[PDB]
């Protein structure tokens, strides 16, 4: 179930490191929200994570 | 519902390092399942972390 997603997807959250603290704790909260799209969370998280990468 | 009280315990578990990936996966299905004990659940968390410091 959700639970092994939950799980995943919000340890790799957390560990992205150009993304600040308030956007993980907002990531997370959205994730247990909606479980159902974390899925899609993560790919953003990700992708937010890759436009705070150094400039 | 408590359902602040759940995300924040669901946010903090996933800072705890010592944790394995099976435990992390209990606390959460715990959490959904019974809100309620959401606080109690963190606290066991934490202890369980330190427990398991390397
Ligand atoms: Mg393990």
Same mark, same amino acid.
């Given at each position: 179930?959700?639970?092994?997603? !939950?799980?995943?997807?919000?340890?790799?959250?957390?560990? !992205? *490191?150009? !993304?600040?603290? *308030?956007?993980?704790? /907002?990531?997370?909260?959205? @994730?247990?929200?909606?479980?159902?799209?974390?899925?899609? @969370? !993560? /790919?953003?998280?990700?992708?937010?994570?890759?436009?705070?990468?150094?400039? | 519902?408590? $359902?602040?009280?759940?995300?924040?315990?669901?946010?903090? %578990?996933?800072?705890? &390092?010592?944790?394995?990936?099976?435990?992390? $996966?209990?606390? %959460?299905? #715990?959490?959904?399942?019974? &809100? #309620?004990? #959401?606080? $109690?659940?963190?606290?066991?968390?934490?202890?369980? $972390?330190?427990?398991?410091?390397?």
């Amino acid at each position: 179930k959700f639970n092994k997603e !939950l799980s995943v997807a919000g340890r790799e959250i957390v560990t !992205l *490191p150009n !993304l600040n603290d *308030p956007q993980k704790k /907002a990531f997370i909260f959205s @994730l247990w929200d909606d479980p159902s799209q974390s899925a899609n @969370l !993560l /790919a953003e998280a990700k992708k937010l994570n890759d436009a705070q990468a150094p400039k | 519902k408590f $359902n602040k009280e759940q995300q924040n315990a669901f946010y903090e %578990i996933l800072h705890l &390092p010592n944790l394995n990936e099976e435990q992390r $996966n209990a606390f %959460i299905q #715990s959490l959904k399942d019974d &809100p #309620s004990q #959401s606080a $109690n659940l963190l606290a066991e968390a934490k202890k369980l $972390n330190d427990a398991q410091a390397p």
